[PDB]
């Protein structure tokens, strides 16, 4: 938390941003067209601000540092002109200190890192002071010359567009035109209303986005060559108004890339004791459940409100896994509201629970002729448990009038006991492992989904089709059109 403030505070520095800032609204290929759109753009011939944080001051001195947080109204346009890698990344959040999950974007000379976590930023970002449980991560390639970025956040989605154009004429924004191609479409779902830059004389221009109605000119290959802004002059307003200057099926879906790590919980060796059950959170994966039921190694695969051979086409937001080891004839106690003490002193289920239950046999794995003695379960407590509560406190349970002051004696007892496992027993005392799956979803983009299919494209027989959701009917054939290498379909 170094203190390097300088306190100069010279606000007024403004420059004209003109014919600058037009991106590709959506992923389509159109050729020789004049399209019209109503969306968030930067007004032509506007005032952008010229921050000059680090500066060589007058003789005998070079010190100023005034890069503050700025309002994030609807989106932002950020332009930089640096001869080196001096600026590095950004921080986004509401209050930036353990109240809303903040977002960090940084990068090396060779790698880039995006992370959403509940930070506690210090003053004048060695950048933060602590980190905790958090949600998302990502790695890819890192992002004179001029570099321009456009940041938008809508509907639980963060979108970043970028462009690199080399100039050497002057420090001001050049006259001319260049569109900005799409780069990143992260799902996060947090809310943002302030931001702050970080760098390691520095100058950058910042401007704000507003809703307008643009007219765009697509040329022969599909690159926005020119644009005109309505509502600027009567002339351009007239420019706007005049608009001038079956046999079978086919299903085809992408590869199956990101398998989901169920090979850990169902294969590990040191699961738990009954009162210290773990909790594993799984997200951002493609999970196939068909491999599980057919495994034939399970002897209890009950379910609640899922209908197993129906779920494979559903997407949730969070999936949790719990795991532990209990004695034999208590697998009939992990269910909706019940009581056999292991449902109301160690583990408790909600009434409207939607999940699945697993139970192996483990006779030949945890056996010990002497006795395993390593698994503990609770026996004494004054009050029952609300759903999903852990208690690892070994306090001495009073059972009499006199306070014993933490002395295990005549009326103060120990609240734990050990399972005596051994191989000469039978079913009903042998150890059964248990894994419980729970599903949840709320107001957030889905991440966990089932695996989709593909059906051996046929082109010369005029049939149905479903290309990644663009259903239709017709005859298919190969073309010579070259898209841009991000566009999907062309209308």
């Amino acid at each position, epitope marked *: 938390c170094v203190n390097l403030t300088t306190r100069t505070q010279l606000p007024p520095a403004y420059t004209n941003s003109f014919t600058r800032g037009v991106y590709y609204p959506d992923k389509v290929f159109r050729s020789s067209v004049l399209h019209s759109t109503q969306d968030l753009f930067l007004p032509f011939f506007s005032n952008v601000t010229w921050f000059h944080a680090i500066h060589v001051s007058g003789t005998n001195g070079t010190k100023r540092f005034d890069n503050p947080v700025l309002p994030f109204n609807d989106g932002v346009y950020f332009a930089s002109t640096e001869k080196s890698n001096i600026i590095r990344g950004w921080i986004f959040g509401t209050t930036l200190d353990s109240k809303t999950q903040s977002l960090l974007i940084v990068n090396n000379a060779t790698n880039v890192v995006i992370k959403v976590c509940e930070f506690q930023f210090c003053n004048d970002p060695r950048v933060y002071s602590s980190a905790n449980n958090c949600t998302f991560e990502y790695v890819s390639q890192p992002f004179k010359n001029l570099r321009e970025f456009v940041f938008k956040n809508i509907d639980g989605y963060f979108k970043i567009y970028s462009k690199h154009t080399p100039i050497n004429l002057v420090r001001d924004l050049p006259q001319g035109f260049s569109a900005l191609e799409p780069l990143v479409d992260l799902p996060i779902g947090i809310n943002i209303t302030r931001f702050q830059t970080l760098l390691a004389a520095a100058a950058y221009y910042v401007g704000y986005l507003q809703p307008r109605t643009f007219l765009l000119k697509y040329n022969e290959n599909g690159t926005i060559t020119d644009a005109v802004d309505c509502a600027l002059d009567p002339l351009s307003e007239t420019k706007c108004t005049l608009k001038s200057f079956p046999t079978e099926s086919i299903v085809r879906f992408p590869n199956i890339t990101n398998l989901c790590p169920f090979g850990e919980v169902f294969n590990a060796t040191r699961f738990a004791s009954v009162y210290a059950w773990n909790r594993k959170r799984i997200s951002n994966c493609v999970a196939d459940y068909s491999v599980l039921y057919n495994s034939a190694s399970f002897s209890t695969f009950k379910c609640y409100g899922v209908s197993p051979t129906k779920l494979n086409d559903l997407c949730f937001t969070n999936v949790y896994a719990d795991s532990f080891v209990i004695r034999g004839d208590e697998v009939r106690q992990i269910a909706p509201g019940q009581t056999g003490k292991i449902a109301d002193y160690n583990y408790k289920l909600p009434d409207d629970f939607t999940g699945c239950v697993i139970a192996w046999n483990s006779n030949n794995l945890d056996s010990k002729v002497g006795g395993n003695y390593n698994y503990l379960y609770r026996l004494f407590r004054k009050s029952n448990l609300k759903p999903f509560e852990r208690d690892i406190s070994t306090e001495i349970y009073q059972a009499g009038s006199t306070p014993c002051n933490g002395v295990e*004696g005549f009326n103060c007892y*120990f609240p734990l*006991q050990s399972y005596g496992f051994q191989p000469t027993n039978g079913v009903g005392y042998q150890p059964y492992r248990v894994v419980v799956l729970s599903f949840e979803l709320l107001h957030a983009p889905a991440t966990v989904c089932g695996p989709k299919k593909s059906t051996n494209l046929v082109k010369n027989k005029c049939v149905n089709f479903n290309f990644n959701g663009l259903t239709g009917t017709g005859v298919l054939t190969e073309s010579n059109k070259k898209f841009l290498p991000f566009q999907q379909f062309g209308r």
Partner: antibody
Amino acid sequence: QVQLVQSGAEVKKPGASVKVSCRASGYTFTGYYIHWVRQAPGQGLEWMGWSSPISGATNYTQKFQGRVTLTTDTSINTAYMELSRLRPDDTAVYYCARDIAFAIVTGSLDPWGQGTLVTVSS
Amino acid sequence: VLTQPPSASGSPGQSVTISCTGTSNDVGGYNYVSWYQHHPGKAPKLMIYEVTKRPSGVPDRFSGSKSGNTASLTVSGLQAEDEADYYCNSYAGSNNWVFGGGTKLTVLG
């Protein structure tokens, strides 16, 4: 079945320490407190102290507070008791007794072992 | 501590009473009195535990009760195999317990 086996005899000298072992076969070891008892030759029985095999908490009698220790090795099913710095008049016999409760101190001592004979003289 | 009569006699067939006199907060405080039978050399064996409750193996001929600050045993029926002495135990207090002196049982057989 439920059996306790105690170690062999022992002869020591004044100013020395002695340690005896009691081994449990049958039941599940954790879950029953264990008491020690001493019988003098010709006198009456007396109480020594109790220990627990699950936590480790232990307690003695009022007069035997200084020179007595006692532990439990919950891996090979055994419990040890050591009395140090024996006067020659402490010739007696020591018994290990198991309680019959379940994680409670109750006091019905059954079953008892066999009994060690300890002899200390100059 | 506490004590009881150190002598007792008996004859086959009939019944005798053997006592154990309690103190203020030795026997009359809490209900944990138990009595044992001690052959000459072997280990003891439970004859009665916690008030008058009895394990399986000991016949019903044994009994007991607690008259405030006094415990007792009565054997209505004698098979001459019971000649050794007997001991009475109770929760003395503060996780420390006390036994009794013992009472030799004499038969005329």
